[PDB]
Each structure stands twice: as structure tokens, then as C-alpha cells.
Amino acid sequence: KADIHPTYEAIEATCSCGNVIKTRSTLCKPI
Amino acid sequence: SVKKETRLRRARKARLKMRELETVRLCVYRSSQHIYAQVIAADGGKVLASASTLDKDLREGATGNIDAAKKVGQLVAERAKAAGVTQVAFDRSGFKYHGRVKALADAAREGGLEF
Amino acid sequence: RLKELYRKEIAPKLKEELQLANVMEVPRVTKITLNMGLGEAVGDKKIIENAVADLEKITGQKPVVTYARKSIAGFKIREGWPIGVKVTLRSDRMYEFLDRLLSISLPRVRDFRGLNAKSFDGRGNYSMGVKEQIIFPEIDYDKIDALRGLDITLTTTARTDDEGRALLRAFKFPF
Amino acid sequence: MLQPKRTKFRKQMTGHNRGLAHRGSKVSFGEYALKATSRGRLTARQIESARRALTRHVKRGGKIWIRVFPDKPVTKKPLEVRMGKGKGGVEYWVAQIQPGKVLYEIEGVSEELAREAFALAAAKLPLATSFVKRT
Amino acid sequence: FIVNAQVRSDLGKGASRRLRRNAGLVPAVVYGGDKEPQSVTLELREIAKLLENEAAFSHVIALNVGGVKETVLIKALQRHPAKGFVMHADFLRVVADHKLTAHVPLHFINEEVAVGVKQAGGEISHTISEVEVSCLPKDLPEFIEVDMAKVELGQIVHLSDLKAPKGVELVQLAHGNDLAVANIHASR
Amino acid sequence: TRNGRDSESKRLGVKLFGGQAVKAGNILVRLRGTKFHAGYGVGLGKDHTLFAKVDGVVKFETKGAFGRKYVSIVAA
RNA sequence: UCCUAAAGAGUAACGGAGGAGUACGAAGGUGCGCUCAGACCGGUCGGAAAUCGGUCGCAGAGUAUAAAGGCAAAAGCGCG
RNA sequence: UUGACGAUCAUAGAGCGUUGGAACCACCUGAUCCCUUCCCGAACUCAGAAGUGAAACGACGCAUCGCCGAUGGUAGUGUGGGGUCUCCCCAUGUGAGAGUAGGUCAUCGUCAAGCU
Structure with missing residues (x-):
């Protein structure tokens, strides 16, 4: 349908977008 | 399976009410490759006319389209008139009367066979 | 992303590993119904519209708020009141959601929060709840209210619970 | 005494007491038994007179089973009351015996100790009972 | 352990009770694996010796139906509940x-x-x-x-x-x- | 405390037994909710009252799975 | 409505047990879809028991209203 | 070799075990286009195979559970007469239920389609 409202334009955004917003583009584990 | 017995659970209503009224039944069976159609006499155990894709003079390799099923309902409207059959009923057999099912049953009304 | 990581790398990797005989025994991940909300102080029903707009925004789909069948567990609902959420995620956008969790949701927890107190059920499914923040794919962390928590109930296509463990062990569940 | 805990109804018909006893006539637990050879009905205070007779003539051991259980309530109108105003209140409870039914069983004793112990319990019951063995 | 029998060609309720008071007999049958079931009269004075025996229930008994001999094991006893005595016997070919x-x-x-x-x-x-x-x-x-x-x-x-x-x-x-x-x- | 009060005995039953001849309005069974189901040529009215539609002989046959009782009228 | 009531109907007692003196414009019609309670194991503040997932089910649920007789073309549940 | 529609409703069921493809069948790929979801291509539907018989489905085996079930006896009962008469007995017609010996892994029909 059309009732599902998308954030998928930004779920399909930049993945390795630095360690500045996501705080990690080097590791996944916090330690 | 899961799908198969539920459309058997859906089909037993209209098939059992066509039994009580003593009507010549036009049954149908859809598959993911191709499409069958039969005309069963008024006892549920005697087949009068029957037309399929799997006859050895129609298999084009592209059966199971909506354009393939229009020819199936074409050829079954005339073997029943060759068998002398009108005044029939249409059991959709649990299939939602929308696509390849509905397009076949329009070919029956064009053929002169009337519901 | 992880779908085609699964299809090309993991899908032959697990076949000899569990000494499987064909393609079709190799287990898949099917859906995420996930949860949300128990019914904390929903005699007055107006907190749902906050909790709807919570999970509506961080998933992409819409809640289907669940009513009560016959309630006794803490309360007498006079059943038929809004109590649940239940957002189901499926194939083309289930791998897309799964990459938020455990890749960039690990920094938003702090104190390892993977498989650290859980185990499976007998049929090969994994269920887990959260209360802390997860990663949001759009910036939505200061929404100031009473944060109700939720679960991440997952269903596989396994047979036993050992094959649930090797399922997405490449996705590195912390142990 | 012996009576049900909760009953689905309060009062009951009279009926009759017919037939022999084909189930209930075989000794199952004990090795000696006191089976009844005349039809009647036992009123649940006779059972405790007959039970407390057997349990003091043993004094040592043995195991006792009580095969029969009263479940049939029986009414009785009070005195100085004309007939036909309802139905009287339940005063006591009754079991219904018919020839062949086994009443008491005993095991773990001598036969000649037990034969002279069922003599004591038979003098409290209004039926003609007998002595039987386990086969 | 030996008994000897007879044929009993009279079947019913009436003819079966006259056996017990007039003659003192006991009805029986012999049914087995190979043959048909066959009915039989025995005495109540004889079966009394076998039923008094201890291990006679789990033991083979030779039956003389006419001059017919058969090894027969006994698996039933229908017994009169009130007085206590043997009623029809119902045993088995081996x-x-x-x-x-x-x-x-x-x-x-x-x-x-x-x-x-x-x-x-x-x-x-x-x-x-x-x-x-x-x-x-x-x-x-x-x-x-x-x-x-x-x-x-x-x-x-x-x-x-x-x-x-x-x-x-x-x-x-x-x-x-x-x-x-x-x-x-x-x-x- | 006091209890008389019975009702007045509706006269239920089964008319028209195994070999009868019928008409078109005969009733054949009052009923109390489907002891007998509608067989071949019978009606099943409002309060589950069976009735005939064609003429012939009553059958009372047991058929099918669930073992239900089918009252059919045979043109014989 | 059940029992007395004797396997067709009927049938008494100041004989044993219970209920009515109404609701509904959808709780009606019709087409299209869909299955219960419970058991259990997993799961955030509930927690013996709410919602969710799962296996086992095989009517033990439900039926506007008493009990009896029924109900998979479901006579039960949802939508136009 | 299968597929549809029946006949008969367990001696036809459940459980266990084995086994079948490229004809059928099922899973499968993608939803652009029909169409659908009180959220979701799960279900419904459309265009379609590759791939696979794993699952499912059919066949083939096992009586382990279930289900049928003799013969004999026994209970009860119609009419006639008895007796020690709140219960039974005799003459005569009738005759279960439970249990025992054992049985059962069904039997057919109509077409399309595989020696056929």
C-alpha cells in the first residue's frame, strides 16, 4: 500500500559516514 | 499442505449447493504452469467434456498466461455444444474470480455456451 | 546489503559446516514481528498515539494496535482496549532493518547487550527485549516523554536451536 | 462419617435393589474378605461400628480396605406432621448391598486370627456375610 | 491333570440350566487356533479337584472329549457370584x-x-x-x-x-x- | 423453595416412517435442531422442520463422514 | 426447559431442580474472507496470569438472554 | 508412471520407516504491470523460469496405539403358572453389554494422461 511512510531514503543513506555522527566507521563493537 | 486444503475448505460450499440443484457443473483447476477445465455431469462422477492445455496439439511452451487461458475456455465451449450441453454452473473451486480464472469464463460466454 | 552478503558468502559457508545435503535445508531468517508495549497505564488510552508515532518513525510501516482478548494479569481491562503495536517486517526491508541493529546499535548500548543473558526456544527462534536507545536512521532521540520499551522477537527457519546459533554468527552476536 | 464432599443435587429417589453382584464380588487387594450373601442397605454408622471392631482385634499390623461407600441420601419427615407438604430433610446416608458384594478386606495376618475378627464385624452388620479367600 | 468330557448338543438358557440341577454338569467350550469351536459338558465334581489345585491354572491339561484327546490350557472361569461355584469353563486348544x-x-x-x-x-x-x-x-x-x-x-x-x-x-x-x-x- | 411449574409438552416426534407415501407439504419430522438432516428431496424449514417437496417413499439413510442422518424421499 | 414419564404422542402430586412479563436499524440481508479454549518454552518496568513468537491442539471455547437439543455449506468471528 | 472429479466413511485412522522426479506437482525468482495487506507480495494475484524433491505430496513397508470382532455363557424381558411373595423360581418364545480366539497399513468408478 501507500500508508507506510518512508524514512528509507535515509535508511539507504551513507553507511560508512565517518565516526562523527555514527561515532564509528572503524569498528562495530563499542569495545 | 497449507494452501491446498484451505482452498478445498473454500470450495466445498458452492460445490455442494450445485449438487442439490442438479446442474451440469463446469469445474476448473489452476496450477503455476497451466490451467485445466472440465464439465462434470449431474452426479459428480461422470465427465462429459474436458479441455486442457496439456493436449498434445496445443502445448506452446508459454501456457499459464492470461492469453493462454483465453484459448482454453474457447475450446471447451464447443465440445459441450458438440455434446449438447447448455444451462451450466461455474464452480471457481476456491479461486478468487479475478485473473486467469475470470478470463477463461469470459471465453465460455463468447463461445455460445451460456450460464 | 546483508541480503547479498548472505546469498553469496554465508549461504555456501554454512552448507558444509552443518554438513547439509542441498540448498534448501540451509536456514533463513523470515520475519520480525518484534513487539511493542505491554499496557502500562493505558486505562486512559492517550499514550498510544505517542507510542504509535515512536515505532512508525523508526521502522517505516504503521502500527496495528492490538486489543485485549480476555485480561486478568494485572488488571481488568474490559477487553477491547488499545494495548499493543505489533509491527511485522519482511524480506526486502527486513535485511535493511537488521543492519541498524548490532552494527550501529552497539554504540548506543554501552554494556554489551547481545546474547549475554538470553537463550532460544526449542524450535529455533530468538527473542530479546530492549529498554535503552537503539540507533535511529533519522535523528529522533530527544522526543521528551516517558520512553516505553519494546522487544526484538525474531523468527528463523531452523529446526533445532544449535542451527539458530550458527545462523548469522557471521553477523557477530556478542556472546 | 463417610459421605461425599459436595453433591450435585440434594435429594434422590428411592428406586429398587435388584440383581446379583457380578462386579464387586472378586477379592482384589487383601487375601481374606467378608462378602455379603443377603441384600440390604447399610447406613454409614454401621460401617464405623464394624471398622472399629476389626482395628482393635488386630492391634499389631495388617492393612484394612473398605470397599463400599455410602452416597445415597435418605430423608425422614419430623414427628407430628401431616403428610404432603414437601419432602423431609436428609438425616443419613446409605450404601446398597446385593448378594456377592465384598465388604471388607484384610491381609498381613493369620487366617485364624482374621476368621475370628470378621466374626466381630459381622455381629454389627444387618446382613448374612461369609468368609472367602483370594484366588 | 486329566479331565474327560462329552458333546452337549443342546444350546440355550433352558437346556443350560437343566444341566446344572438335574445332572450336576457344567457346560464348556473348546476353541483353538486350527479348528472350529466345540461345546462340551463336564462335571462339577471333577473341575472341583482341578480348581482346588495350585498351579493348575498355568499348566497344560489333557482333555478327553469323546475318545478325542487334546492338550488344553484354561483361560476363563465364569463363576456364580452369590453362592460360589463353577459355571461354564471356556478353555483353549494348544x-x-x-x-x-x-x-x-x-x-x-x-x-x-x-x-x-x-x-x-x-x-x-x-x-x-x-x-x-x-x-x-x-x-x-x-x-x-x-x-x-x-x-x-x-x-x-x-x-x-x-x-x-x-x-x-x-x-x-x-x-x-x-x-x-x-x-x-x-x-x- | 416451592417448585411446581412445568410446561405444556409441544408434541414433538417423527411422523411418516420407513415405507410411507407422501405428498408435497407433509412434515415427516418436527424436530429440535437437526437430529435428522435434509436429504435428497426434503426441505428443512425455519425451526428445522423437515418437509417434502416431491412425491414418493421416505428412506431414513445414514451417509457420509460425520455419520449424519439423511432423510431422503425416493421416487419409488 | 429438564426429571418423574414405562426406547412413538400423551400423562398426576402443597413431587424434585431452574428461568421469562425483554433486547437489536445491526445483534437483520448478501457477497467475500477466517478459526477455539487451554498446555506448555522464549521474551522490556505486568508477571500465578495483559501484549508478541512459537510448537502441541483435534470444540474440552463460542451462541444477546435459563436449561435442553444442536452447529465445517460452520448456525461461531471479521470487512464491503 | 500422474493429475482432476467422485463412490464408501476408521478392517479406510495415527505413529514409525523407506522412497519418487525433470512428464506432472510443489517449493522457487521478481512485483514493473492486474491486484492485495485495519502493518507486511505471509495469504491473495500477475509475469516467469533457472534451482530443488529438502520441506510438502504420493507410493511402498511395520499391528507398536487405535478400530472392527467371533462361539459359548450370562443379565434382562413377552405370554402361561408358581413359591418361603420389599425378591426370585418353572414351562415356552427371545437374547445383549462387557470380555476371549482373532482381525485390519482399505476397496472401487469417470476422464485427461505413463507399458498402457
């Missing part, structure tokens, strides 16, 4: 090969001195008897010896503990169960 089923007495052979009895104030409560059999008709089990002289105040004894000799099965282990047999407990 084929050399078809398995068989009967019931077997127990004895509890050594319980004079038991550790549960001599050391602690003891009791021995025989719950079961007449345990069945599933044998081959060539070699018969007359009885089964059980020995509860041995271990404990406070143990029950199952069917798994006692042993059926020379390769004889027990039906209760063929079903998914194991009945308790005897107990040792404290007296009141």
Missing part, C-alpha cells in the same frame, strides 16, 4: 506354534528374614499377584519366585527387578509401563 497368553502365580519365597523386617520394624505388603505370561507352549512357567529378603525398609519393588526365566517376556513391559510389586514399610 498349538505347537502360536505364542500363547496365560496368568502365573507368584510366591514371594524368602521373606522370613528381611533387612527391612529384622533391623527396622518391618512389614511386607504384596500389592500384585497373578502376573501374566507370554511364552512358548513347549516349556511352561508354573510360577515365579520373588525374594524380598534383601534390601531395605522403604523400597518398593518393580516388575523390572524380578526376572522371567528361560526367555519369557512380560506384557506389562511390552506396554510402556512398569508396575510396582511389593513394598516394605513401617507399621502403625
Whole structure:
């Protein structure tokens, strides 16, 4: 349908977008 | 399976009410490759006319389209008139009367066979 | 992303590993119904519209708020009141959601929060709840209210619970 | 005494007491038994007179089973009351015996100790009972 | 162990009760594996000697129907409930090969001195008897010896503990169960 | 405390037994909710009252799975 | 409505037990879809028991209203 | 070799075990286009195979559970007469239920389609 409202334009955004917003583009584990 | 017995659970209503009224039944069976159609006499155990894709003079390799099923309902409207059959009923057999099912049953009304 | 990581790398990797005989025994991940909300102080029903707009925004789909069948567990609902959420995620956008969790949701927890107190059920499914923040794919962390928590109930296509463990062990569940 | 805990109804018909006893006539637990050879009905205070007779003539051991259980309530109108105003209140409870039914069983004793112990319990019951063995 | 019979060509309720008061006979049948069922009269004075015998229930008896001889095992006794005496007998032909089923007495052979009895104030409560059999008709089990002289105040004894000799099965282990047999407990 | 009060006995039953001849309005069974189901040529009215539609002979046959009782009228 | 009531209907007692003196414009019509209670194991503040996932089910649920007789073309549940 | 529609409703069921493809069948790929979801291509539907018989489905085996079930006896009962008469017995017609010996891994029909 059309009732599902998308954030998928930004779920399909930049993945390795630095360690500045996501705080990690080097590791996944916090330690 | 899961799908198969539920459309058997859906089909037993209209098939059992066509039994009580003593009507010549036009049954149908859809598959993911191709499409069958039969005309069963008024006892549920005697087949009068029957037309399929799997006859050895129609298999084009592209059966199971909506354009393939229009020819199936074409050829079954005339073997029943060759068998002398009108005044029939249409059991959709649990299939939602929308696509390849509905397009076949329009070919029956064009053929002169009337519901 | 992880779908085609699964299809090309993991899908032959697990076949000899569990000494499987064909393609079709190799287990898949099917859906995420996930949860949300128990019914904390929903005699007055107006907190749902906050909790709807919570999970509506961080998933992409819409809640289907669940009513009560016959309630006794803490309360007498006079059943038929809004109590649940239940957002189901499926194939083309289930791998897309799964990459938020455990890749960039690990920094938003702090104190390892993977498989650290859980185990499976007998049929090969994994269920887990959260209360802390997860990663949001759009910036939505200061929404100031009473944060109700939720679960991440997952269903596989396994047979036993050992094959649930090797399922997405490449996705590195912390142990 | 012996009576049900909760009953689905309060009062009951009279009926009759017919037939022999084909189930209930075989000794199952004990090795000696006191089976009844005349039809009647036992009123649940006779059972405790007959039970407390057997349990003091043993004094040592043995195991006792009580095969029969009263479940049939029986009414009785009070005195100085004309007939036909309802139905009287339940005063006591009754079991219904018919020839062949086994009443008491005993095991773990001598036969000649037990034969002279069922003599004591038979003098409290209004039926003609007998002595039987386990086969 | 031997009986001798007759033919009984009179079937009903009326003719079957006149046998018991006039002549003193007892009806019976012989039904088996190979042949038809055949009815039979026996005396109430004879069966009385066999039913008084101990192991005669789990044992082969030779029957003389006419001058006809057959090895016959007995599996039924319909018995008059009020007075107590034998009514029709209902026994069985014995084929050399078809398995068989009967019931077997127990004895509890050594319980004079038991550790549960001599050391602690003891009791021995025989719950079961007449345990069945599933044998081959060539070699018969007359009885089964059980020995509860041995271990404990406070143990029950199952069917798994006692042993059926020379390769004889027990039906209760063929079903998914194991009945308790005897107990040792404290007296009141 | 006091209890008389019975009702007045509706006269239920089964008319028209195994070999009868019928008409078109005969009733054949009052009923109390489907002891007998509608067989071949019978009606099943409002309060589950069976009735005939064609003429012939009553059958009372047991058929099918669930073992239900089918009252059919045979043109014989 | 059940029992007395004797396997067709009927049938008494100041004989044993219970209920009514109404609701509904959808709780009606019709087409299209869909299955219960409970058991259990996993799961955030509930927690013996709410919602969710799962296996086992085989009517033990439900039926506007008493009990009896029924109900998979479901006579039960949802939508146009 | 299968597929549809029946006949008969367990001696036809459940459980266990084995086994079948490229014809059928099922899973499968993608939803652009029909069409659908009180959220979701799960279900419904459309265009379609590759791939696979794993699952499912059919066949083939096992009586382990279930289900059928004799013969004999026994209970009860119509009419006639009895007796020690709140219960039974005799003459005569009728005759279960439970249990026992044992049985059962169904039997057919109509077409399309595989020696056929």
C-alpha cells in the first residue's frame, strides 16, 4: 500500500559516514 | 499442505449447493504452469467434456498466461455444444474470480455456451 | 546489503559446516514481528498515539494496535482496549532493518547487550527485549516523554536451536 | 462419617435393589474378605461400628480396605406432621448391598486370627456375610 | 491333570440350566487356533479337584472329549457370584506354534528374614499377584519366585527387578509401563 | 423453595416412517435442531422442520463422514 | 426447559431442580474472507496470569438472554 | 508412471520407516504491470523460469496405539403358572453389554494422461 511512510531514503543513506555522527566507521563493537 | 486444503475448505460450499440443484457443473483447476477445465455431469462422477492445455496439439511452451487461458475456455465451449450441453454452473473451486480464472469464463460466454 | 552478503558468502559457508545435503535445508531468517508495549497505564488510552508515532518513525510501516482478548494479569481491562503495536517486517526491508541493529546499535548500548543473558526456544527462534536507545536512521532521540520499551522477537527457519546459533554468527552476536 | 464432599443435587429417589453382584464380588487387594450373601442397605454408622471392631482385634499390623461407600441420601419427615407438604430433610446416608458384594478386606495376618475378627464385624452388620479367600 | 468330557448338543438358557440341577454338569467350550469351536459338558465334581489345585491354572491339561484327546490350557472361569461355584469353563486348544497368553502365580519365597523386617520394624505388603505370561507352549512357567529378603525398609519393588526365566517376556513391559510389586514399610 | 411449574409438552416426534407415501407439504419430522438432516428431496424449514417437496417413499439413510442422518424421499 | 414419564404422542402430586412479563436499524440481508479454549518454552518496568513468537491442539471455547437439543455449506468471528 | 472429479466413511485412522522426479506437482525468482495487506507480495494475484524433491505430496513397508470382532455363557424381558411373595423360581418364545480366539497399513468408478 501507500500508508507506510518512508524514512528509507535515509535508511539507504551513507553507511560508512565517518565516526562523527555514527561515532564509528572503524569498528562495530563499542569495545 | 497449507494452501491446498484451505482452498478445498473454500470450495466445498458452492460445490455442494450445485449438487442439490442438479446442474451440469463446469469445474476448473489452476496450477503455476497451466490451467485445466472440465464439465462434470449431474452426479459428480461422470465427465462429459474436458479441455486442457496439456493436449498434445496445443502445448506452446508459454501456457499459464492470461492469453493462454483465453484459448482454453474457447475450446471447451464447443465440445459441450458438440455434446449438447447448455444451462451450466461455474464452480471457481476456491479461486478468487479475478485473473486467469475470470478470463477463461469470459471465453465460455463468447463461445455460445451460456450460464 | 546483508541480503547479498548472505546469498553469496554465508549461504555456501554454512552448507558444509552443518554438513547439509542441498540448498534448501540451509536456514533463513523470515520475519520480525518484534513487539511493542505491554499496557502500562493505558486505562486512559492517550499514550498510544505517542507510542504509535515512536515505532512508525523508526521502522517505516504503521502500527496495528492490538486489543485485549480476555485480561486478568494485572488488571481488568474490559477487553477491547488499545494495548499493543505489533509491527511485522519482511524480506526486502527486513535485511535493511537488521543492519541498524548490532552494527550501529552497539554504540548506543554501552554494556554489551547481545546474547549475554538470553537463550532460544526449542524450535529455533530468538527473542530479546530492549529498554535503552537503539540507533535511529533519522535523528529522533530527544522526543521528551516517558520512553516505553519494546522487544526484538525474531523468527528463523531452523529446526533445532544449535542451527539458530550458527545462523548469522557471521553477523557477530556478542556472546 | 463417610459421605461425599459436595453433591450435585440434594435429594434422590428411592428406586429398587435388584440383581446379583457380578462386579464387586472378586477379592482384589487383601487375601481374606467378608462378602455379603443377603441384600440390604447399610447406613454409614454401621460401617464405623464394624471398622472399629476389626482395628482393635488386630492391634499389631495388617492393612484394612473398605470397599463400599455410602452416597445415597435418605430423608425422614419430623414427628407430628401431616403428610404432603414437601419432602423431609436428609438425616443419613446409605450404601446398597446385593448378594456377592465384598465388604471388607484384610491381609498381613493369620487366617485364624482374621476368621475370628470378621466374626466381630459381622455381629454389627444387618446382613448374612461369609468368609472367602483370594484366588 | 486329566479331565474327560462329552458333546452337549443342546444350546440355550433352558437346556443350560437343566444341566446344572438335574445332572450336576457344567457346560464348556473348546476353541483353538486350527479348528472350529466345540461345546462340551463336564462335571462339577471333577473341575472341583482341578480348581482346588495350585498351579493348575498355568499348566497344560489333557482333555478327553469323546475318545478325542487334546492338550488344553484354561483361560476363563465364569463363576456364580452369590453362592460360589463353577459355571461354564471356556478353555483353549494348544498349538505347537502360536505364542500363547496365560496368568502365573507368584510366591514371594524368602521373606522370613528381611533387612527391612529384622533391623527396622518391618512389614511386607504384596500389592500384585497373578502376573501374566507370554511364552512358548513347549516349556511352561508354573510360577515365579520373588525374594524380598534383601534390601531395605522403604523400597518398593518393580516388575523390572524380578526376572522371567528361560526367555519369557512380560506384557506389562511390552506396554510402556512398569508396575510396582511389593513394598516394605513401617507399621502403625 | 416451592417448585411446581412445568410446561405444556409441544408434541414433538417423527411422523411418516420407513415405507410411507407422501405428498408435497407433509412434515415427516418436527424436530429440535437437526437430529435428522435434509436429504435428497426434503426441505428443512425455519425451526428445522423437515418437509417434502416431491412425491414418493421416505428412506431414513445414514451417509457420509460425520455419520449424519439423511432423510431422503425416493421416487419409488 | 429438564426429571418423574414405562426406547412413538400423551400423562398426576402443597413431587424434585431452574428461568421469562425483554433486547437489536445491526445483534437483520448478501457477497467475500477466517478459526477455539487451554498446555506448555522464549521474551522490556505486568508477571500465578495483559501484549508478541512459537510448537502441541483435534470444540474440552463460542451462541444477546435459563436449561435442553444442536452447529465445517460452520448456525461461531471479521470487512464491503 | 500422474493429475482432476467422485463412490464408501476408521478392517479406510495415527505413529514409525523407506522412497519418487525433470512428464506432472510443489517449493522457487521478481512485483514493473492486474491486484492485495485495519502493518507486511505471509495469504491473495500477475509475469516467469533457472534451482530443488529438502520441506510438502504420493507410493511402498511395520499391528507398536487405535478400530472392527467371533462361539459359548450370562443379565434382562413377552405370554402361561408358581413359591418361603420389599425378591426370585418353572414351562415356552427371545437374547445383549462387557470380555476371549482373532482381525485390519482399505476397496472401487469417470476422464485427461505413463507399458498402457
